Design a protein around this ligand. Structure first.
Ligand SMILES: *[C@@]1(=O)C(=O)N([C]C(=O)O[C][C][C][C])C2=[C][C]=[C][C]=C21
Ligand SMILES: *[C@@]1(=O)C(=O)N([C]C(=O)O[C][C][C][C])C2=[C][C]=[C][C]=C21
Ligand SMILES: [Cl-]
Ligand SMILES: [Cl-]
Lengths: 187, 187
């Protein structure tokens, strides 16, 4: 059976960190739902790219649960995810069921806000380290991608392919990830 | 004065190759117009990401000319660009005025279709080489980014950051490109 991914898309999301994982996961045969935090309407990303979500979060939640929940970064995107009770509920449920949660750039700061994965080794964008580490609830890593059990984090737009391929590997295995990687012309 | 970029967005465009250059160019202070080939409506990209263009191509053309014209790849995107009389006119004008033209993945095959930049050293996605080289009108390169004068080409999603930063360097210089690069967390 096909794996399923929920990508939560908020105003101010970093559009590269949203699109690269969506695209790469689809290349891997994952069924991906791009879910609008605010509803079903188009979302203005951080650099003004406008993306039309597949569904509202409210609706995508009804079709849960998912094999992965993905949190893009972007400062204002991650803040919107951090402030959302709906995101809180989704992440708590995911953690409780031992499902994967993946977050990139400032995205992992939503894990802090929602008290998810405490004690994990994590990375973030360098600029988001201090926010993530407030209280010493995680251990910090400078690895480009950090997978600690079911908490998978990464650093920035430039690590988005690596992040996405790590998700693919976690869900579908090493061999699928390698097959998906080759046509991309990655260094 | 600020440089201006026209990114031509067709149905079936590779969304990573569209979004990474748009975002990176905006980070560089370039004024970017995402122009819908078919009109003003949202565009279904290759992996089903839906992007709302800033304008129709018809309208963006009236605000021309541009310091760069950018052609994303995607097989079906590049075919739509290749078949477009409007794209032909835009590229011929750009070439005649000695403005930069940048194309990635299958995107450079539109240069062939429109008889642009013949004699240039170019690259493409490996799978698009034979189409690009039909007639021996270009010389082929395996470099991740190839800049030959005002024809700038690149290979795939995994070379999109390098492609975008090369555009930035061409328009705004080495130092701006380096400054834009550092926060991205690129290898
Ligand atoms: C990331 O895409 C991203 O999310 N940020 C935001 C950030 O780190 O802000 C720190 C503020 C505390 C949350 C960012 C910054 C720079 C380049 C890329 C990215
Ligand atoms: C590119 O994004 C892309 O454009 N292609 C299409 C391609 O090369 O098709 C060749 C058919 C002749 C035009 C592609 C293919 C695979 C991965 C990435 C990309
Ligand atoms: Cl941001
Ligand atoms: Cl394609």
């Amino acid at each position: 059976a096909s794996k399923r991914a929920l990508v939560i898309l908020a105003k101010g999301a970093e559009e590269m960190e949203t699109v690269i994982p969506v695209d790469v996961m689809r290349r891997a045969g994952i069924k991906v739902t791009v879910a609008g935090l605010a509803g079903k309407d188009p979302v203005q990303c951080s650099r003004d790219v406008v993306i039309c979500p597949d569904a509202s979060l409210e609706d995508a939640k009804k079709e849960g649960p998912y094999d992965v929940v993905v949190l893009p970064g972007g400062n204002l995107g991650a803040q919107n995810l951090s402030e959302s009770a709906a995101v809180k509920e989704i992440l708590k449920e995911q953690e409780n069921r031992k499902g994967l949660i993946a977050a990139i750039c400032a995205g992992p700061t939503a894990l802090l806000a929602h008290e998810i994965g405490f004690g994990s080794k994590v990375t973030t964008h360098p600029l988001a380290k201090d926010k993530m580490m407030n209280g010493g609830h995680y251990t910090y890593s400078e690895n480009r991608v950090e997978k600690d059990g079911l908490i998978l984090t990464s650093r920035g737009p430039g690590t988005s392919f690596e992040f996405a391929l790590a998700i693919v590997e976690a869900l579908n295995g090493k061999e699928v990830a390698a097959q998906v990687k080759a046509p991309l012309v990655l260094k």
